[PDB]
Paper text:
PLK1 is a master regulator of the cell cycle that is upregulated in mitosis. PBD interacts with phosphosites characterized by the consensus motif S-[pS/pT]-P/X23.
Using isothermal titration calorimetry (ITC), we found that recombinant PLK1PBD bound to the pT207 peptide with an affinity of Kd = 0.09 ± 0.01 µM, similar to the optimal affinity reported for an interaction between PLK1PBD and its phosphorylated target. A peptide comprising pT207 and the mutation S206C could not bind to PLK1PBD, as predicted from the consensus sequence requirement for PLK1PBD interaction. Analysis of this 3D structure showed that, as expected, the 17 aa BRCA2 phosphopeptide binds in the cleft formed between the two Polo boxes. The interface between BRCA2 and PLK1PBD is stabilized by 12 hydrogen bonds: the backbone of residues T200 to L209 as well as the side chain of S206 are bonded to residues from Polo Box 1, whereas the side chain of phosphorylated T207 is bonded to residues from Polo Box 2 (see the zoom view in Fig. 3l).
Author numbering:
A (entry chain D): 199 to 210
B (entry chain A): 370 to 593
Amino acid sequence: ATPPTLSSTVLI
Amino acid sequence: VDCHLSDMLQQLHSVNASKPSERGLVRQEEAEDPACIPIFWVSKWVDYSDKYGLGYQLCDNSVGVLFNDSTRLILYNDGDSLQYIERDGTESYLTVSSHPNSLMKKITLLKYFRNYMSEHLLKAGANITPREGDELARLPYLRTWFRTRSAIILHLSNGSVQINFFQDHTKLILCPLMAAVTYIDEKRDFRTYRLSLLEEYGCCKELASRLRYARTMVDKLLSS
């Protein structure tokens, strides 16, 4: 799986 | 819902010209309006622009993708109903259960984007409750978007403009039909203000700064 360029706030 | 950007630009010009953070006593709380809360906004998004495009989730749990070829595929919150928008803007309504073989590739991509967002990302404004008839409203799609060193700008088909600031996670949702602005602050507090009332009562330097930035962003959307 290739990670995206950018994304919104990730879960914690 | 086309000529809405120019209305938003005029509304922003009006509020910014009034210098709202420069009042004798700013009474921002008096500019609040709960009746102006937006029905739709982008709760999650993923940038895969190098090869596929931008995936996003709306607050109603519907997912969409704006592909690199400038086409859009939207999956309704039921997980079967689909909406496909061509570059010209022509809409087509289909289902996953009975989909044309022509969309197999784009549907597969949307399902990957949907699964990524579900597994990895936090839902913005998750605490907000929907009103009595909001579910019948026309589901908007992402018209256009762009990134800056400070924010992501999202322009919806219903005329609304969303600005998500990277550094402090603050967000603006501008609705031109209601001439209102929703601000989600650092403490994740969700407040909606009438723009004509921010002119009347003023606001904090924080919000006033975001509104000046918003005017620059709307100008960029209109020039594009």
